[PDB]
Structures are given as C-alpha cells and as structure tokens.
Design a binder for this molecule. Structure first.
Ligand code: CHL
Ligand code: CLA
Ligand code: CLA
Ligand code: CLA
Ligand code: CLA
Ligand code: CLA
Ligand code: CLA
Ligand code: CLA
Ligand SMILES: CC1=C[C@H](O)CC(C)(C)[C@H]1/C=C/C(C)=C/C=C/C(C)=C/C=C/C=C(C)/C=C/C=C(C)/C=C/C1=C(C)C[C@H](O)CC1(C)C
Ligand SMILES: CC1=C[C@H](O)CC(C)(C)[C@H]1/C=C/C(C)=C/C=C/C(C)=C/C=C/C=C(C)/C=C/C=C(C)/C=C/C1=C(C)C[C@H](O)CC1(C)C
Lengths: 223, 212, 202, 39, 229
C-alpha cells in the first residue's frame, strides 16, 4: 500500500479503512477517532465544494469569456434576468436554505441514521451506508464498487482543493483567470511567470457594494 | 490529568480541582490555608460578577454611544448623570453605601457563620438567605429561576462558565481602564480604529505602551 | 557525544561536582540549539544578497542583512506589512509558546503529550532524549532508521552547525568592520585576494 | 505562606508597619489640617 | 414523539407529560418542578394574551383602517378620562390576577363564587379552570391543549414581529405584508440593514421621539435601537 513518501511508516490509526489513506498525518490530528470522523466529513465537504468551484470557474470562463470570476460576485456583473438585484434578499434566500440543509447534515453527523426520512412526506428515506455518503435521491443514477469510487472522489477533491486555491492565488497575483494565465504562460514561459507576477496583489481594495464596503484581503502583503 | 495553566508543571497540593476554574494557578501560594482559599474564592466570585456586570454596562453604553443616540462614554457618564438630573453627588454616594453595606455585611457575617442569616431575624425570611456553597447563595431570591438544584452536573458546568466569563470580564475591565489611559478614547472607538488599520493602529503605535 | 573530538581545553563537561547550567545535558543541548539557529542565520543573511545577485528578487529588497530593521541605526527596510514592533509582539507570543513548550519537555520529559493542544499531542511526545524529539513532524521522513546512520546524521548536523556558528560570528565582525554584506566580501576577496583582506580594511 | 505570615508577625516587621501607619496618619492629618496649635 | 430537532434527545426532566412538550429546554430552566409549575402557568398566560393581542391588531386593522395600532393609545377619544379607565383596569385586573394567583399558590382554593354561595367551579388542573370559563368544548382536551399552546407560541412570535415591524417600517402588519408582497427581494430585514467589519447600517426608527399626550410628553423609545442591525 504505497504511502505519501518512501520509507515513512504510517501511523497506527491510519490503516486503509478510509478511502485515500496514504498514512499522511504529520501533525497527529486524527489521533482521536471522533475528531478523525469530523475531519473526514470536513475533508469531504471541502473536496466537493472545491470540485464544484473548479468546474464552475472552468465553465464560467469557457462559455462567457468576459466574466472574470473574481469580479463575478458584484451586482453589476450578473446574468440577464437578475442584474441589478438587491443582494440582501439573495443572501436571505441563501441563508435560509443553506441553514436548513446544513443543520440536516449536522444532525446526520451527531446522530447517524436519524435524519434519513423526509419530515413532510413520511414515505421517503435515504439509506446512508457510510457517514458522509447519503445516497438514495442523492444518487439518482446509482452506480454504487463503492471503495474505488470513493478513492477517485477523494483524490479528485484534493486535486481540486489545490487547484482552486491555485486559481485564487494566481488570480490575485496577475489579475487574470486560470485559462488566461495558462495562455499567458504558453505565450512566453520565461516572462509572465511566478518569479515576476508575485509581490503585486491585484485586489482592488474595498469595492463599494450598493450600500456597504467589504474589506478586501490578499493572501500575502503584495499591494 | 486535568488541564493546568502551565503545561508540564504539576498543580499545587492545595488546588485539587474541586473548585470551578481550578487550573493550579497559584505561583505565589496565596491560598495555602483552606480558610484563606475559601475567602479568596468568594472574593474572586464577587470581583468577577462586578466585572461582568460593569463590562456589559461598558459594552452596551459604547454601542449606544458610537451610533448617534446621545449616550456618553463611560468616563463621562457619572458627570453627565449627576449634572443632567438634579442629583447631588454625596447623597447618592451615602445611599449607595447604605444599601451596599447592608447587603455586603449580610454576606460578611454569613461567611463568618455559615448558616446564620436565615434565622428569621431579617424581616421574616428563612432559608432564602441560607447559602448553598461559598459564594453561591441560591434560594428563592438570588436563584429565582432555580437552576442550582436540578441537573447538578449542568450546575457545575454553569459554575465553570461563570468563573471563566468572570475572569474574562476582569481582564476586559482592566483593558478598558488601561486602554482609555493610553488612547484617551471610548473602547468601541478603539475597536473601530483597529478594524480600520489592523496592521497600523494597535498598541505598538501609541507611543505609550512601548515607549521605544 | 555527537561531535566528541576531545576539544575541551577548559574542562566544562566534567560530570564530577557539576551543577547549574554547566552540565553535559544543558551544554550539548544548547550547542545544537545555537547550531540550528546559526544555520538558519547564515542562510538567511546570505540569501537576499545572492538572490539579488542572480536577479531573482527585485532591488527594493535584496538589502544587506543588518539593514533589515534588526538595527534601525544601521538601516531599516520600510515596506513590511507592519511596523517592526507590531512584528515583534507576534514574535514575542510565538517564540514564547515554542521555546517555552520546548523548555517544558526538557525539564519534564514527555510532558507535552498529555494536556490538550488542539490535537497536537502525539507530535510532541518527544523521546527519552532532549535535542532530538522526532515523531511525526520533527522527523517527517524516517531518516536515520539505522542507528549508525542516525549517529552519522547527528555528526553532520554538529559539523555543519559549528561551521555556521563560525560563519555568523564572521558575518558580525565583517559587518562591523567593513560595513558591507558578506557576499560583497566574497566579490571583493575573489576580485583582489591580495589587496582586499583584513589587513587592508584596518 | 503560614511561615511568611509568621515572619510578618515578628516584632520589627510589625513595629515597622505600625509606625508607618501611625506616622502616615499623623502626616495626613497635618496635611489636610495644616498647623494645629489649639482646640 | 416529535421533537424540536428530530433525532436528538430531550432533556431528562422533559418526559412528554405536559401538552406542547417537544423536548426544547437548552438552558435547563424546567429542571425544578416548583419552577416548572410557575413557568407552565406563565407560558399559558403569555400565550393567551398574545393570541388576543394578535387577533386585536388584525381585526383593528381590517375593520378600522388609517389607525396605526401603535398609536391606538394616543389617537383614541372618549369622554371616559384616561385616569378613570386606568383606575377601572387597575382594580378589576388586580382582582382577577389575585384570584388566579391564589389558585396558583393554593391549588383549588378559589373555586367558589364569593357573592353567590350556590356556584362552585369544578375541580381541575392549574392553568385550565373550566366550568363557566369553558361552556362549549369541540372535541377532546388532550388535543385542544396542544392546539392552544401551538397557536399561542405562534402568536407570541407574531406579536414581537408586529412590534419590530412597526418600529422599523412604521406600518401595520397587513401593510408591511403588502410591502413584502410588492418587493420581496427588496423589502426584507437583510435588505434594510447590515453589519460588516468596515461599517454598520441600521434602519431609521419610524417612531420619532417622545410622544406628546395631553400635556405630559410620554417618552416613546424604540426597543434596543443600538443593537438592531
Ligand atoms: C400592557 C400592555 C400595553 C402595551 C404593550 C402598550 C404599548 C404601547 N403604548 Mg399603550 N400599551 C399598553 C397598555 C396601555 N397603554 C395605555 C395608554 C397609552 C397612551 C396614552 C400611549 C400609549 C402608547 C403606547 C406605545 C408606546 C409606549 C412606549 O413606548 O412605552 C414607554 C413608556 C413606558 C414604558 C411607561 C411605563 C408603563 C409601564 C411599563 C406599563 C405602544 C403601542 C403611546 C403611543 O401610542 O405613542 C406612540 C402613548 O402615547 N399607551 C393604557 C391606558 C389605557 C394602557 C393600559 O392598558
Ligand atoms: C468526479 C469526482 C467525484 C467522484 C469520483 C464521486 C463519486 C461518488 N460520489 Mg460524489 N460528489 C462529487 C464528485 C464526485 N463524486 C461532487 C463535486 C459533489 C458535490 C455536488 C458530490 C456529492 C455527492 C453526494 C451527495 C453523494 C455522492 C456520492 C458518490 C458515490 C456514488 C455516486 C456515483 O456513482 O458518482 C460517480 C461519480 C462520477 C461518475 C463523476 C462524474 C463527473 C461528472 C459527469 C462531471 C459533471 C460535469 C461538470 C458539471 C462540469 C461515489 C463514491 C453518493 C454516495 O456516496 O451514496 C452512497 C452520494 O449520496 N457525491
Ligand atoms: C523565502 C524567503 C523570502 C521572504 C521572507 C521574502 C520577502 C519579501 N519579498 Mg520576496 N521573493 C522570494 C523570497 C522571499 N521573499 C523568492 C524565492 C522569490 C522568487 C519567487 C521572490 C520574488 C519577489 C518579488 C518579485 C517581490 C518580492 C517582494 C517581497 C517583500 C514583500 C512580500 C511580497 O509581496 O512578496 C511576495 C511573496 C513571496 C515572493 C514569498 C513566497 C515565496 C517564498 C519562497 C515562500 C517562503 C518581502 C520583503 C516584493 C517586494 O520586494 O516589494 C517591494 C516583490 O515585488 N519577492
Ligand atoms: C480580582 C481578584 C482575584 C482574586 C481574589 C482571585 C482568587 C483566586 N484565583 Mg483568580 N484570576 C483572576 C482574579 C482573581 N483571582 C483574574 C483576573 C484571572 C485571569 C487572568 C484569574 C485567573 C485564575 C486562574 C487560571 C486560577 C485562578 C485561581 C484563583 C484562586 C487561587 C489563587 C490565589 O490564591 O490568589 C489569590 C489572589 C489575590 C489575593 C488577589 C491578587 C492581587 C494581586 C496581589 C495584585 C496583582 C495582580 C496582577 C498581577 C496585577 C494587576 C494590577 C493592575 C493595576 C495592573 C483564588 C480563589 C486558581 C483557582 O484555583 O481557581 C479556583 C486558578 O487555577 N485565577
Ligand atoms: C454569564 C455567565 C454566568 C453564569 C454561567 C452564571 C452561573 C450561575 N450563577 Mg451567576 N451571576 C452572574 C453571571 C453568571 N452566572 C453575574 C454577572 C452576576 C452578578 C449579577 C451573578 C450573580 C449571581 C448570584 C447572586 C447567584 C448566581 C448563581 C449562579 C449559579 C446558578 C444560577 C444560574 O444557573 O444562572 C445561569 C446563568 C445564565 C444562563 C447567564 C445568563 C446571561 C444573561 C442572559 C446575559 C444577558 C443579560 C445582561 C444584563 C446583558 C450558576 C453557577 C446563584 C448560585 O450560585 O446558587 C447556588 C446565585 O445565588 N450568580
Ligand atoms: C561576580 C561574581 C560571580 C562569580 C565568581 C560567579 C561564579 C560562578 N557562577 Mg555565577 N552568577 C553571577 C556572578 C558570579 N558568578 C551573577 C551576577 C549572576 C546573575 C546573572 C550569576 C548567575 C549564574 C547562573 C545561572 C550560573 C552561574 C554559575 C557560576 C559558576 C560557573 C560559571 C562559569 O564559569 O561559566 C562560564 C560563564 C559563561 C558561559 C557566561 C559568560 C558570558 C555571560 C553573558 C556573562 C558576561 C560577563 C561580562 C562581564 C559581560 C560583558 C558585557 C559587555 C560585553 C557588554 C561559577 C561558580 C553556573 C553554575 O552554577 O555552574 C556550576 C550557572 O549555571 N552563575
Ligand atoms: C514632646 C513635646 C511636644 C509637644 C507637646 C508637641 C506638640 C505639637 N507639635 Mg511638635 N515637635 C516635637 C515635640 C512636641 N510637639 C518634637 C520633638 C519635634 C521634632 C521631631 C516636633 C516638630 C514639630 C513639627 C514640624 C510640627 C509640630 C507640630 C505640633 C502640634 C501638632 C498638633 C497635631 O499633631 O494635630 C492633632 C493631632 C491629632 C488629631 C492626632 C491624635 C489622634 C487622636 C485620635 C486624637 C484624639 C483627640 C481627642 C502640637 C502642638 C505641628 C505644628 O504645626 O505646631 C504648631 C508641626 O507642623 N511639631
Ligand atoms: C424613561 C426614560 C427613558 C428614555 C428617554 C430612554 C431612552 C433610551 N433607552 Mg433606556 N431605559 C430606561 C429609561 C429610558 N430610556 C429605564 C428606566 C431602563 C431600565 C428598564 C432602560 C433600559 C434600557 C436598555 C437595556 C437600553 C436602553 C436604550 C435606550 C435608547 C434607545 C431606545 C430603547 O432602546 O428603548 C428603551 C429600552 C427598553 C428596554 C425600554 C425601557 C424604557 C422604558 C421607558 C422604561 C420605563 C420604566 C419606568 C419605571 C417607568 C434610548 C436613548 C438602549 C441603548 O441604546 O442603551 C445604550 C438599550 O440597549 N434603555
Ligand atoms: C490569581 C493570582 C494568584 C497568584 O498567587 C498571584 C497573582 C498572579 C498576583 C494573582 C493574579 C491576580 C490577578 C491577575 C488579578 C487581576 C484582577 C483584576 C484585573 C480585577 C478586575 C476587576 C474589575 C472590576 C471589579 C471592575 C468593575 C467595573 C465596574 C463596576 C464598572 C463600572 C462603570 C460602568 C459600568 C460605566 C460607568 O459609566 C462608570 C463605571 C463606574 C466605571
Ligand atoms: C569549544 C569550546 C570548548 C572549551 O571548553 C571552551 C570554549 C573555548 C569557550 C568553547 C568555545 C566556544 C565557542 C568558540 C563558541 C562560539 C560560539 C558562537 C560563535 C556562536 C554564535 C552563534 C550565533 C547564532 C546562534 C546566530 C543566530 C543568528 C540568527 C538567528 C540571525 C537571524 C537573522 C537573519 C537570518 C537575517 C535577518 O537580517 C535578521 C537576523 C535576526 C539578523
């Protein structure tokens, strides 16, 4: 069972029970089992939201090559039906529905096998075989074997976490999207590199939204 | 076993973990005697409860003072209350010392004799001024909602929360005092100034806290 | 024992009638702590000059090492994200945590693996030996699996460290006397080895 | 701490504390009531 | 047995005995039984006053428009003086309240009519008298008590919503509901106020200042206006 580096011995709590186990815990954060279950759920959440974000930024840049996702959150940079919208009501919709689904998944973590049923229509229920893997209506095509697909899912999610923070970091550095930065590196690879572009954040310093000013931050003191 | 304030060192012998907030913090050994430690437990609780009460007063008055509601800042509030109303200063001082000396002397002689203030000598009241622990006087008056007699483990949890929030408010009140002594401003003004420039508006820019 | 070449002319590793901070347990451990801080000091005092020489970092940086803000009389770089005292309080808190937990494992061996430190307790279980904790982070890769390989790596750490300590003392004396950086002293000694020495700069 | 208060209970320490209290009380009286000769 | 969170466990003092018991006590305020009797009575009394209040505000806005219910104490007119109405309310409510409180502290001791020795109210539980207070009952008490506590909790939330929507918008509940039906994306509480670490914005209070009644200048403040947004 290849590990994260040659010669390194995996810890005693890392065995192969979880998918994508390379024995890599140099801080010993998964030494407690309940904390390890919580960080596995957090890994699944960050992995799936980052895969959605990478596929997002990819398609948004391909289909409409004038978005520049770093500016896409503004009210002016919005699609054709909703393009001058009150952001308060949008955040209200998001807060209510996300607080609902999030509290459902949190109670799944707290009590495994207790929020499977639909509370309104009581003849509906998802069978979750593992924690973090609901199934049922969440698996409509139903390809689930399961272990190798979970390894594919966690490797893709780790790669997409690294790639999304790459997108954010690069986009703060040179002010361009990922495909535009790829075309800039393919134009000349020696000029327009990381050796030149870093040190200058393209963060536009507290954009005034409709009523308020958000403080904007760069991950490094570039300015 | 239990978490100590200073990891690696063992706790002292007189701090066992029976007390709420018992982290073994006694480097000057001020409480080796059990009676002196009992007295200091009650002094810690009284200072903590006054600091929580005063710190919530500071925070609410400063929230009302930054937004234009006309509230004073807390270093001017006593002057503008005595001058806005027709209140004379020394009569309100003496009435405060009357009421506070009554209540505090009842607490004092209940520390000296640990069940004695529930003899019915005060107006007719009995077992409503009997204490429960040192510094924990819960009856019908001081604990009207009745949380110290059901779910005793949850009551120990509330004791821990009370001591932690009290130490936090004591260092917060010391913060308000020293913070105003350096900056000369209200505390949430200083909070807004820290949120404006965190890297440049802080205690290493006053010229007071580090004079180098 | 690592680096035991017998060079002790003033006799300070004598176990008989020893005490205080002059003990083999304190002296060997402080020797490797000074060695590691001086390796980091030597690399850090060279690296801006050679990265400005190679043209990798810009000319706003690449300043001499004593002009960083260590000695504001000797020069100070403005362009950090804060004032150096705002940096220095973060340094106080951070180094207080690090150095102080390291002190507690020296005085009480193994004591840093019991009390809760956000799950970071198996990382700091240490060994039955100071100066070489190991574990999952201080020795990430299993390097020194053979005991003889471990002794050889400890000896190489000792020798590279003592060389770096001599180098940092040289950076200090060179920085005071000629007023320039150490890579500038490399360029001036390699250009004219006869006419640019300590005998010239008097 | 018991032995430290026993040491503070010794004769020169208590004489120092008590004469500091008595001298300070007289000094504060002569400050707030400057130069009393009668009454 | 349904819960406030389906799947969790109720506190150990909440068995399911009382009506409307869904295991909701995070602070543990009902672990004392002698407290829990008082709080059950207070829950019933707050719920009944709030149900009557919400019905009063709704019928008061439907039947008589152009009367803002927050100004009902101001713009009412009667040859009945204000102190005379307040005195009648004081004596009659002191009577009724002391009868109910005596039934609380002594269970079943004020059942008999004092004027007429014939009529005695039948034995019951505290909070649920019966008799002349309940001449007609539809169905069974074991479901109607649950219906009563559910409608009452909902009306308590409705009354504090009325107070906040009147202090923020300055309009009645039906008028503010039509305001939310006109622009739902633009008229919410998220759409009027926000706090960001840069700045904070709160809605202006539409109730102006101390209100001038008949030469007394009643101070009329808006509830916790510094902690609003
Ligand atoms: C107990 C239920 C009750 C509630 C929730 C209210 C609520 C109100 N009264 Mg009303 N009243 C109530 C009972 C009565 N009022 C009045 C006669 C008035 C008058 C004349 C006025 C109000 C006004 C008000 C409004 C704002 C007052 C304020 O800001 O308080 C601040 C004042 C206090 C807290 C005083 C202390 C009273 C004590 C706590 C009770 C608000 C709608 C005022 C208004 O409509 O202007 C917008 C107004 O002018 N009320 C009488 C006498 C019949 C009542 C007795 O039942
Ligand atoms: C490509 C990476 C990847 C892989 C290999 C998996 C694999 C799996 N998912 Mg996961 N999932 C993913 C991404 C992925 N998922 C993302 C991004 C989310 C957030 C939307 C989820 C949210 C999610 C939920 C809620 C559930 C699963 C479940 C599963 C398991 C069975 C379902 C299945 O057969 O899908 C196989 C996956 C693929 C065939 C990937 C196809 C890639 C598509 C075509 C890309 C679409 C184009 C894009 C929009 C541009 C299987 C382990 C279920 C489970 O475990 O039930 C027991 C389950 O309930 N996933
Ligand atoms: C590893 C040590 C190290 C440290 C402490 C610094 C520190 C600094 N760099 Mg330098 N730099 C370094 C290595 C380092 N650099 C390397 C290896 C490169 C080539 C990629 C550069 C290329 C570079 C450029 C082009 C610029 C800086 C700048 C700066 C200054 C502002 C921070 C910033 O915005 O840069 C961005 C942060 C980094 C480059 C560090 C990330 C990479 C290292 C290896 C991580 C460790 C700061 C003094 C800026 C400056 O001088 O402003 C006047 C500036 O414009 N650096
Ligand atoms: C307000 C006064 C006060 C008092 C009387 C106590 C009393 C106690 N503390 Mg508490 N403590 C306090 C404030 C106080 N504390 C604050 C503000 C914090 C947060 C920093 C703590 C954090 C703390 C911990 C972590 C622990 C204790 C513990 C204890 C108990 C044993 C220690 C002892 O014997 O010292 C008795 C103390 C005094 C007689 C008062 C000391 C006043 C000195 C002489 C003045 C100097 C104070 C400071 C250094 C400078 C402030 C001055 C300012 C103008 C700059 C005892 C009940 C231990 C315990 O077992 O809890 C139950 C324990 O583990 N305390
Ligand atoms: C906020 C933290 C806090 C906590 C956890 C406690 C907890 C406790 N208090 Mg203490 N108390 C506090 C603050 C707190 N107190 C303050 C500030 C004072 C001075 C007013 C006191 C004065 C006091 C007295 C006189 C007595 C207690 C007693 C108790 C014990 C039982 C009562 C109870 O469970 O209330 C639970 C507490 C809360 C749920 C905190 C509510 C916080 C409010 C809602 C904040 C908002 C209001 C504020 C003005 C703004 C329990 C250990 C009694 C006791 O020990 O009986 C044996 C007792 O007699 N307390
Ligand atoms: C003035 C008389 C005096 C004498 C005769 C001694 C003698 C001794 N001390 Mg003591 N000590 C003294 C003052 C003195 N000390 C003072 C003032 C302090 C408080 C700082 C101490 C605190 C102290 C500790 C903590 C320890 C000793 C130890 C010792 C013993 C071995 C020290 C040694 O040789 O190591 C060689 C000396 C060094 C490695 C340090 C030299 C460099 C430091 C910084 C001193 C620099 C002095 C110099 C004048 C400053 C120049 C400043 C200028 C360049 C700007 C020896 C018995 C040690 C012991 O007990 O072991 C058995 C021990 O652990 N002493
Ligand atoms: C032994 C003879 C003697 C006598 C009878 C006095 C008497 C006095 N001296 Mg003199 N003096 C003396 C020796 C004496 N002194 C010596 C030896 C020195 C040199 C150390 C001085 C140097 C000196 C100075 C510099 C001053 C005095 C002053 C006084 C007057 C102080 C009144 C007072 O203290 O307030 C009243 C005291 C109290 C209220 C404290 C008593 C507390 C109890 C409870 C009161 C009970 C009352 C019923 C008082 C007339 C002061 C003065 O102004 O003289 C006119 C003054 O400034 N004396
Ligand atoms: C009667 C004169 C009077 C006036 C003009 C004000 C005015 C104000 N109060 Mg204050 N308040 C008062 C009495 C008064 N108060 C009394 C007697 C209490 C103790 C119950 C309070 C408790 C209180 C709190 C906790 C807060 C205010 C706050 C405020 C400000 C915002 C409005 C508000 O939140 O409603 C007032 C708030 C209430 C909870 C209503 C109580 C006020 C009525 C009039 C009390 C009448 C009782 C009396 C015996 C008859 C405003 C300047 C807020 C503020 O900004 O503080 C920084 C705030 O947070 N008030
Ligand atoms: C433990 C120990 C032990 C060992 O042995 C030794 C040692 C170390 C020494 C020790 C320690 C100690 C400490 C730390 C202490 C501290 C304390 C504090 C700070 C307190 C406060 C405390 C504090 C407090 C009470 C406070 C309170 C407050 C208040 C009321 C306030 C009030 C007010 C207000 C509202 C406002 C208005 O307008 C004004 C006023 C009037 C201003
Ligand atoms: C052997 C013996 C034996 C006999 O018995 C006796 C006798 C003789 C006594 C002995 C001897 C000894 C000796 C010789 C010693 C020496 C030492 C040294 C030199 C040290 C240093 C040491 C040194 C060290 C640590 C150092 C360190 C450093 C550092 C950190 C630095 C840092 C830095 C950097 C990076 C850069 C920037 O800019 C900043 C700074 C801040 C600047």
């Amino acid at each position: 069972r290849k590990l994260w580096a040659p010669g390194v011995v995996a810890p005693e709590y890392l065995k192969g029970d979880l998918a994508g186990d390379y024995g890599w815990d140099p801080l010993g954060l998964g030494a407690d089992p309940t904390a390890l279950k919580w960080y596995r759920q957090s890994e699944l959440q960050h992995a799936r939201w980052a895969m959605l974000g990478v596929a997002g930024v990819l398609v948004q840049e391909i289909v409409k090559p004038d978005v520049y996702f770093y500016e896409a959150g503004l009210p002016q940079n919005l699609p054709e039906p909703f393009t001058n919208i009150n952001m308060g009501g949008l955040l209200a919709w998001e807060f209510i529905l996300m607080h609902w689904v999030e509290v459902r998944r949190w109670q799944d973590y707290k009590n495994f096998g207790s929020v499977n049923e639909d509370p309104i229509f009581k003849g509906n229920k998802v069978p979750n075989p593992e924690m973090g893997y609901p199934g049922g209506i969440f698996d409509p095509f139903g390809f689930s074997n399961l272990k190798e697909l979970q390894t594919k899912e966690i490797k893709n999610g780790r790669l997409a976490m690294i790639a999304y923070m790459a997108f954010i970091l690069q986009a703060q550095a040179t002010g361009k999207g990922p495909l535009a930065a790829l075309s800039a590196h393919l134009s000349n690879p020696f000029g327009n590199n990381i050796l030149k572009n870093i040190g200058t954040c393209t963060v536009p310093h507290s954009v005034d939204v409709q009523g308020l000013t958000i403080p904007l931050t760069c991950l490094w003191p570039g300015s | 076993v239990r978490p100590v304030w200073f990891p690696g060192n063992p706790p002292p012998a007189h701090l066992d973990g029976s007390l709420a907030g018992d982290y073994g913090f006694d480097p000057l050994f001020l409480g080796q005697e059990p009676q002196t430690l009992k007295w200091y437990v009650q002094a810690e609780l009284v200072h903590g409860r006054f600091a929580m009460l005063g710190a919530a007063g500071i925070i609410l008055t400063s929230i009302g003072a930054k937004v234009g509601l006309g509230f004073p800042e807390w270093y001017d509030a006593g002057k503008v209350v005595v001058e806005k109303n027709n209140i004379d200063f020394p009569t309100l001082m003496v009435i405060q010392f009357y009421l506070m000396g009554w209540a505090e002397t009842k607490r004092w002689y209940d520390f000296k004799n640990p069940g004695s203030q529930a003899d019915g000598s005060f107006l007719g009241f009995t077992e409503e001024f009997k204490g429960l622990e040192n510094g924990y006087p819960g009856g019908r008056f001081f604990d009207p909602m009745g949380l110290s007699r059901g779910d005793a483990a949850k009551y120990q949890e509330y004791k821990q929360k009370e001591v932690k929030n009290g130490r936090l408010a004591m260092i917060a009140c010391l913060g308000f005092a020293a913070q105003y002594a350096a900056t000369g401003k209200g505390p949430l003004d200083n909070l807004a100034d820290h949120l404006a420039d965190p890297n440049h508006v802080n205690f290493a820019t006053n010229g007071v806290s580090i004079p180098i | 024992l690592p680096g035991d070449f017998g060079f002790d002319p003033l006799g300070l590793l004598d176990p008989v009638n020893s005490g205080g901070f002059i003990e083999p347990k304190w002296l060997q451990y402080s020797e490797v702590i000074h060695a590691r801080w001086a390796m980091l000091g030597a690399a850090g005092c060279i690296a801006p000059e050679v990265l400005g020489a190679a043209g990798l970092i810009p000319d706003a940086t690449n300043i001499k090492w004593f002009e960083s803000g260590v000695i504001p009389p000797a020069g100070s770089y403005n362009g950090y994200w804060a004032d150096p005292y705002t940096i220095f309080f973060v340094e106080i808190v951070a180094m207080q945590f690090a150095e102080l937990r390291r002190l507690q494992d020296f005085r009480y061996p193994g004591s840093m693996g019991q009390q809760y430190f956000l799950g970071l307790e198996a990382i700091f279980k240490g060994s039955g030996d100071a100066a070489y904790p190991g574990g999952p982070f201080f020795n990430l890769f299993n390097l020194g699996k053979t005991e003889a390989a471990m002794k050889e790596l400890k000896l190489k750490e000792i020798k590279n460290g003592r060389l770096a300590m001599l180098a940092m003392l040289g950076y200090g004396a060179q920085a005071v006397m000629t007023g320039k950086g150490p890579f500038q002293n490399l360029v001036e000694h390699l250009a004219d080895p006869v006419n640019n020495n300590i005998l010239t700069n008097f | 701490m018991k032995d430290f208060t026993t040491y503070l209970s010794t004769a020169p320490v208590i004489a120092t504390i008590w004469f500091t209290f008595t001298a300070g009380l007289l000094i504060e009286i002569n400050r707030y009531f400057p130069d009393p000769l009668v009454f | 047995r349904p819960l406030w969170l389906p799947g969790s466990t109720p506190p150990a003092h909440l068995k399911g005995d009382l009506p409307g018991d869904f295991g909701f006590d995070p602070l543990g305020l009902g672990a004392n039984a002698e407290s829990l009797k008082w709080f059950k009575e207070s829950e019933l009394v707050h719920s009944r006053w709030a149900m009557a209040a919400v019905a009063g505000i709704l019928v008061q806005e439907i039947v008589r428009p152009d009367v803002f219910w927050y100004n009902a104490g101001k713009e009412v007119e009667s040859p009945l003086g204000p102190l005379g109405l307040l005195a009648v309310e004081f004596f009659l409510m002191h009577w009724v309240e002391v009868r109910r409180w005596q039934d609380l502290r002594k269970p079943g001791s004020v059942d008999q009519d004092p004027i007429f020795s014939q009529y005695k109210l039948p034995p019951h539980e505290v909070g649920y008298p019966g008799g002349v207070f309940a001449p007609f009952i539809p169905g069974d008490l074991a479901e109607l008590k649950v219906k009563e506590i559910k409608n009452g909790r909902l009306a308590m939330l409705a009354f504090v919503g009325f107070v906040m929507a009147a202090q923020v918008t300055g309009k009645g509940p039906i008028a503010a509901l039509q305001e939310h039906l006109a622009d739902p994306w633009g008229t919410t509480i998220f759409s009027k106020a926000a706090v960001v670490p840069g700045q904070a914005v709160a809605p202006p209070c539409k109730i102006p200042a101390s209100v001038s009644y008949k030469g007394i200048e009643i101070p009329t403040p808006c509830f916790l206006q510094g902690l609003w947004p």
